[PDB]
């Protein structure tokens, strides 16, 4: 068959939303506290994540149907998915060659080791990089990548969600677009869809592990004082 | 006459405390979010103030008698004086020639204008620079400068103070040392002391004005999100 106008318009909105919230040159990274190789990398990565959350929020407000949700559900969705949306969008900077996120010269190239200096362990980093590698290999089209982020963000299976019925529906309409798109516009993408949903499950586990490690980092004021207000608000338990 | 051993030991402790909490090269400033010429300078100045508070705290813990106070009174004293201790120690970087705080190349030289881009008005900056100029002209000895900071920090006239009797006494012993020192070690310093106390009063007004302007900056989340946890904690009203 072939996509519908509404389906195609949703794709247009998401692709443009992402273009408007993701710089492939990473020129803003110089405004971040410099990276440094106890948790010497925490200041830079905190600023990177904080900047990124702001971007995820901008992209979110442009997901069709999201802004109609109550402010409470928007926040519930952002708070629980932010970390996953970030791991997803970061894949654009990940490189299978050097197994790192390359965003600049020697300074903005992030290795597993560097994240270790932000207070995280292999318990998290191993699966993360493993996830980044698997996702990169799916050679997603920008359209499928942007849909995967909108779909992940509209997971009604998040703590604190209220109108989990309307959220459920919205995620479904997006899932429909992604499925149609793959079938119609992506040759050899017969299994793709199923693989992409599997990626959402890996994100849940990564999310869980990150939350544990973040909690510890969070309870130590000497470390929490290195984070930013926004990061503290989005990853905090005060709901 | 001549200073006593105890009096001289207090001077030794304060001078060394200050040396251990104030770098005249300002090499740490590169770890701060870069300055930028809506409130483009706020990120850098927030980091500068946050870094400075940490330093004021280090110096404070070394003021003789301060650490014996209850944690509650230590916090009460820090929270209400921090801003003043900062304006005082900043005089070391202020220059009458260019009417600015010079801490680095073109980047770390702060003019009234730059502070304007941090959300502050002439209502504050005018008296500040005026204060910096007057204080610089007193050509204080490092010993008198360090005493003036310890004395300002131990002002029992601060909201939230409890044991205002012991604090009162401590400030008095320091005032005694400063007075003796000026008389004994500072030629032509007959009026000095009186002038230094007058400076403490100017600081109260500067403190008040800064508090007003900070409150406004503080209530706007788009701006408060640019501050740091420590700055938010020390200048916040949650006591």
């Amino acid at each position: 068959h072939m996509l519908s106008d509404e389906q195609m318009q949703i794709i247009n909105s998401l692709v443009e939303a992402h273009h408007k919230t993701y710089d492939d040159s990473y020129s803003d990274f110089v405004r971040f506290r410099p990276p440094v190789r106890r948790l010497s990398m925490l200041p830079h990565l905190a600023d990177l994540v904080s900047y990124s959350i702001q971007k995820v929020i901008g992209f979110a407000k442009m997901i069709p149907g999201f802004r109609d949700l109550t402010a409470e559900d928007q926040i519930a969705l952002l708070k629980s998915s932010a970390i996953e949306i970030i791991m997803l969008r970061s894949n654009q900077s990940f490189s299978l060659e050097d197994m790192s996120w390359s965003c600049g010269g020697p300074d903005f190239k992030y290795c597993i080791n560097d994240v270790t200096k932000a207070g995280h362990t292999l318990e998290l980093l191993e699966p993360l990089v493993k996830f980044q590698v698997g996702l990169k290999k799916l050679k997603l089209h920008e359209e499928e990548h942007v849909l995967l982020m909108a779909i992940c963000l509209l997971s009604p299976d998040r703590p604190g969600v209220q109108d989990h019925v309307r959220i459920e529906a919205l995620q479904d309409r997006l899932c429909d677009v992604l499925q149609a798109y793959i079938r119609i516009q992506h040759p050899g993408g017969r299994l793709l869809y199923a693989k992409m949903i599997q990626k959402l499950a890996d994100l849940r586990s990564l999310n869980e592990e990150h939350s544990k490690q973040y909690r510890s980092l969070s309870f130590q004021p000497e470390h929490s004082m290195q984070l930013t207000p926004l990061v503290l608000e989005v990853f905090g338990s005060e709901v | 006459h001549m200073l006593s051993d105890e009096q001289m030991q207090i001077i030794n402790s304060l001078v060394e405390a200050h040396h251990k909490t104030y770098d005249d090269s300002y090499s740490d400033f590169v770890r701060f979010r870069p300055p930028v010429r809506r409130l483009s300078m706020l990120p850098h100045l927030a980091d500068l103030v946050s870094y400075s508070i940490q330093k004021v705290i280090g110096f404070a813990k070394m003021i003789p008698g301060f650490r014996d106070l209850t944690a509650e009174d230590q916090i009460a004293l820090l929270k209400s004086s921090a801003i003043e201790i900062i304006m005082l120690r900043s005089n070391q970087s202020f220059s009458l020639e260019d009417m600015s705080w010079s801490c680095g190349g073109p980047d770390f030289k702060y003019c009234i204008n730059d502070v304007t881009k941090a959300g502050h008005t002439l209502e504050l900056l005018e008296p500040l620079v005026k204060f910096q100029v007057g204080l610089k002209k007193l050509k204080l000895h490092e010993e008198e400068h360090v005493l003036l900071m310890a004395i300002c920090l131990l002002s029992p006239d601060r909201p939230g103070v409890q044991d205002h009797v012991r604090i009162e006494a401590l400030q008095d012993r320091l005032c005694d040392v400063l007075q003796a020192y000026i008389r004994i070690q500072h030629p032509g310093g007959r009026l000095l002391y009186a002038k230094m106390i007058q400076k403490l009063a100017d600081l109260r007004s500067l403190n008040e004005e800064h508090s007003k302007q900070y409150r406004s900056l503080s209530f706007q989340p788009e701006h408060s999100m640019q501050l740091t946890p420590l700055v938010l904690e020390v200048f916040g009203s949650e006591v």
Binding site: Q54, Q74, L230 | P221, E222, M225
Partner: peptide, 10 residues
């Protein structure tokens, strides 16, 4: 309260 998230979500 989520002061920041609220403001950013416009």
């Amino acid at each position: 309260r989520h002061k920041i998230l609220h403001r950013l979500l416009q």
